[PDB]
Amino acid sequence: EIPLKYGATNEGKRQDPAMQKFRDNRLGAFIHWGLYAIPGGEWNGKVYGGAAEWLKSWAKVPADEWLKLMDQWNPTKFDAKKWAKMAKEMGTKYVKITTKHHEGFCLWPSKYTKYTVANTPYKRDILGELVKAYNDEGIDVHFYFSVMDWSNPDYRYDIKSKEDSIAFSRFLEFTDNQLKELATRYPTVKDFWFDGTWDASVKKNGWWTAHAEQMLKELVPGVAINSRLRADDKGKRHFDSNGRLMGDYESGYERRLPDPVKDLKVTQWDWEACMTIPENQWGYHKDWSLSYVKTPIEVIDRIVHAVSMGGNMVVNFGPQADGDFRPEEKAMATAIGKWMNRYGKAVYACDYAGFEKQDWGYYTRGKNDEVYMVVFNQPYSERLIVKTPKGITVEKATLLTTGEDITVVETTRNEYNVSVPKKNPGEPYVIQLKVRAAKGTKSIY
């Protein structure tokens, strides 16, 4: 039992309506947009395979010369209403936007630095326009914010002298100033998702992370803050030295989701995964043939996976320099939206069902105790195994899309075969189960 001033604050999951909304949303989109979209992974003739948003680093570009990319920031095809229509049609209930990435360029007209949209040919407050457009479509907006900033000389990677400490202190002042600014210009913000918080400097300043969390919660009622922000008194990040989760939800699982058999611990807190369509490209990269690019079904599989274990999933997009989306991303959003329109009752506002994982796919649980079977892998046996928790029985099964009744055969105490539909749906599909919890056997139902 280690005593701590800047360790965890929340007892269990938050159950206030704004957290319920953050959670019930389930499906988000990420936007990574900034100066990196101009060179798109290429610099001085060399195409770099690393993440396009890190190209300043891959190509060893000095800050002064990286930031002169602002002179070419002119996204004439940008239209925030079109971006919000795209998100709505994909079935997202929220969008997270890079307000400022590591390069330090701000997508709003910050009064605290010259490296902003204000000082580009385009001049306009892109951040404000997107906030309005998404909110007009009924889509919540979350702000990604990089603490690490390659544009501000005051930033330190570690505190190695009194000078470093004085310097980093003003940098933290500067960071609070931008945070207050985003919270006061854009009060409909629902979440701040921090990044670039892993350096020794930040870990040494745990108190500052707790302060930022508190500051923003005073400024924006109900606002959510990701675990990635937080370091405790010992420099321990995400979960404090007593294993307790800091911030409002766990953020991680980029490129590997929690294991549905081994990582059931995650159902005990709120959490959010974010993913890329290629293997590791968040900002726009001009050449997607360099790594594996996920198909719509592989993405939909990850989204349902997340919801089945009590978490959110956010699919990333890296808009072109011009303010439009490349065709792969338009195809992806469309394909996702088509499936979500059909099967979304087993994703939106669903949660962990407390059933043993089976091979055919994933269970999710609705707000009224519906139990959905989302089938990704069709058994040649024509039978979907359903093993129930103690005291739970399956009274009915129904194909979601048509309401057709589906046979359920009991095979042992607590196990059934649910038949596959008479006609193969030809895509990942949903069977809704009606279940009954027996009088006073303890269970989550």
Residue numbers in the entry: 35 to 479
Give sentences from the paper.
GH29 α-l-fucosidases catalyze the hydrolysis of terminal α-l-fucosidic linkages. GH29 α-l-fucosidases process their substrate with overall retention of configuration at the anomeric center of the cleaved fucopyranose and do so through a double-displacement mechanism. In this mechanism, first proposed by Koshland,, SN2 displacement of the aglycon (activated through protonation by the general acid/base residue) by nucleophilic attack of the catalytic nucleophile yields a fucosyl-enzyme intermediate, which is subsequently hydrolyzed to yield α-l-fucopyranose together with the released aglycon. Crystallographic analysis on bacterial α-l-fucosidase confirms that the ABPs act by covalent modification of the active site nucleophile.
The crystal structures of α-l-fucosidase from Bacteroides thetaiotaomicron in complex with compound 4 and 5 provide strong evidence for the covalent binding of cyclophellitol aziridine to active α-l-fucosidases and by this virtue the validity of the cyclophellitol aziridine design for activity-based profiling of retaining glycosidases that employ the Koshland double displacement mechanism. “Aglycon” here reflects the aziridine N-acyl moiety to which the BODIPY tags are grafted in ABPs 1 and 2 and which is designed to occupy the space normally occupied by the substrate fucoside. The 3-D fold of BtFuc2970, however, appears not to provide sufficient space to accommodate an extended aryl aglycon pendant to the atom, which would equate to the ring oxygen in fucose. N-Benzoyl aziridine 4, bearing a bulky aromatic N-benzoate group, is about eight-fold less active compared to its N-acetylated counterpart, 5.
